[PDB]
Every structure is written in C-alpha cells, then in structure tokens.
C-alpha cells in the first residue's frame, strides 16, 4: 500500500564519533565567552551600536539603533560616547536612561554546501547598563578619552585646540555605566559541509 | 576693576560668508537622505544590527542588539533574516513584534584641530516596523533569497543541498514587514579644521 511504503520511506551521528578537541577551548555552550574576553574586545573596538527606548506616536516603547564612536573606561566601569540623536520623548523614568550597547568584529562570510551551515565570522558583546548625560569637566574629560583612543596619537590640546565651553554646551556626552554584559564568538576557518551533497567548488574556498 | 575687566574679556561668521555650492547635492537638513537612496544602500548592505524589546528582571522591557544577515526584498516590502538569539519573554503583545532595523557604511575616521569636528564618515539607515516568524515554503523561500543574496552566485539546491523540512524546524525565519524607515549620510573627504590652531601634520592627512 501507498500508506505503508510512504511510511517506511518517511523511516547516522557524527554527534558521536571520533572528533579533534584542543583542551584549551572554551566549553562554555552558546558560543560564550569569557569576561576576560569581553574586556578586550571593548578595550581594541572603536565603533558601537546603542539602543535605547524612546516613546511612539502609540505610547509605546520603541528602540533607536545609533552606530557612534566609544572609549570603555574599564576603571570608571563605564563606556563613553557622544551623539546628538534624540527621538521625542525617552521611553524612562529618572536622570539617567537603560541603554545597551553592541561591540562585533564581523570577518568573513563562510560558504557551505549545505544551506543551514551558511554563517558569518563573528565576535561579538552585548553590555547593559545605565546611560547619563555628563557636565563640565566629566564631560571635557570624556570628551578627551574618547577622542584620544579613537584617534591614537591625537592629543587634545596639543593636536587639537582645547575643547571649550561652547564645545560643552553643544555636545551631549555620555556615560554608560555597565550592569552586565554578554560576549559571543563564531570564528571558524571553514563552515560546517555535508560530505554527501557535492562538494563546493575551488571558486568558493580558493 | 577685575569684574569689569573680565567681563570686557568674555567679551566673525564663515556661517555667512562666501563658500561654493553643489546645486544637486542634498538640501535636507540634519544629513538626512532620500527614500532612493535608502533603497540603494539596503540593496547593497549585507549585515545589519537588529533591536527587539525583552522583558527584563525588573518588568521593564529592554532591547538586545543582534548582528545579522540579512536581504531586503522591495516587491514584498520587508527585509528578511534568521537568528535564533532569544531572551525570556518578548515585551509585545502579538503574533509579531516591533522591530528597528540599522544598516550602515562605516568609512574612515577623520581628524581634525578641531576637538568637536573629529568624526567618522558614515552612512546609516534605521528601518522601523513588524517581526513575524515565517513558516513552511515562505520560510524557505525567504530563507533562500536571504542565503543567495549574501553569497553572490551559491544557488540552493545546486551549490547546496535542498533546504529540508529539519532545517526549518531549527531555524527561527524573519520577515521584518516595513513601516518607515530614516537614512543619514555624512560621507567628507576631511573634517572640518580651525585655521587659527596649527594646522594637522603630514602624519594625519597625508
């Protein structure tokens, strides 16, 4: 019968099998990393993603996505960037505002003969945290960290005039005080294939 | 006296004064772009950062930041991508939920004398509207645009293996449905520069 024989039609691990383990990799599952990790990736990135919640025409929370330049400030246990976006009104109660803010490096994109293993070289931290306006000399002083580390040499001051009063009055800078955060990597050399469908082609991986 | 003398201390307007104009380039104010150009730079991009709100400890909805491939489709009016990064509970109410969706180009940092004039040359694009998980061929389908767009000549089902029904059982399949959208460009070939600092070195501009 049709029934039976789709059935038996309808109906193997690797999972399991001898495998290479280097001892000295992380275990940790989800692609996680360690705190240490995390550190450094903030300490040698430049470029950030914030998101934090403005209210909408509809009343609800809604997030903005800013890509902007930042110092972590490991010390203070802070981050700092400067940005002059605003929606209307924050989506916050207080002083101070929920922000969370995104570090990657993205290398390259893997291809794979099979559909699923397709990915993307990627390392990458979430940090959450608490967000408030500096004032005066915290400002400056921000100012100075985040200009100097992005510009690695420049010396405000020397290479650049002193930041002023007026610079202060037109500038929103901000510290993001870190709560947590959360670090992921997926940096293979190769993507995962399937040894039983054909083989991708020198033009791939050449 | 000292007031009156420093109040004679406290005490002009390139704003005003002769420069050369473009007349095609962009008259929108604060760097905003057109909705062509936002269609051009989503057609072209292959990474985005995507926000969704989550419910926090505290009861408060905040939002993550995920990295991700992605493809836009005009016809259809969404922008597709697969991710399975999840928190406890979305902060929506819905077979959908709100999403921002950032796109940018990231050029070079750009020095200046001027401390407030450092900047980075960028093109950006915020995406606001509606998540909703795709199941079935439009799972697959979008699965296979997405797969196709960001590897420029792998066609599935020839360079890869047929997506199956497991595949889509383990993948989470986005169409982010689009409200409306914002795009900034600030794209110069310097910074700004203050005359009357000593002008940067070789080193910087050279």
């Known amino acids: 019968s049709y029934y039976h024989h789709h059935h038996h039609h309808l109906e193997l691990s690797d999972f399991y099998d001898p495998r290479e383990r280097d001892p000295s990799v992380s275990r940790r599952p989800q692609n996680r990393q360690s705190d240490e990790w995390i550190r450094e990736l903030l300490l040698r990135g430049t470029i950030a993603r914030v998101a934090t919640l403005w209210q909408g025409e509809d009343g609800a929370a809604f997030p903005f996505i800013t890509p902007l330049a930042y110092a972590y400030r490991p010390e203070q246990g802070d981050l700092v960037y400067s940005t002059n976006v605003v929606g209307r009104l924050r989506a916050n109660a207080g002083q101070g505002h929920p922000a969370t803010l995104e570090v990657s490096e993205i290398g390259q994109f893997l291809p794979s003969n099979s559909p699923l293993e397709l990915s993307v070289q ?57 709560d947590r955060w959360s670090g992921k990597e997926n940096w293979a050399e190769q993507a995962i294939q399937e040894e039983d469908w054909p083989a991708l082609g020198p033009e791939w991986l050449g």
């Open 122 to 178: 990627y390392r990458s931290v979430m940090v959450f945290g608490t967000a408030r306006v500096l004032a005066g000399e915290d400002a400056r002083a921000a100012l100075t960290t985040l200009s100097e580390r992005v510009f690695p040499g420049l010396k405000v001051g020397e290479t650049t005039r002193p930041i002023s009063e007026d610079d202060l009055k037109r500038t929103s800078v901000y510290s993001l005080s870190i």
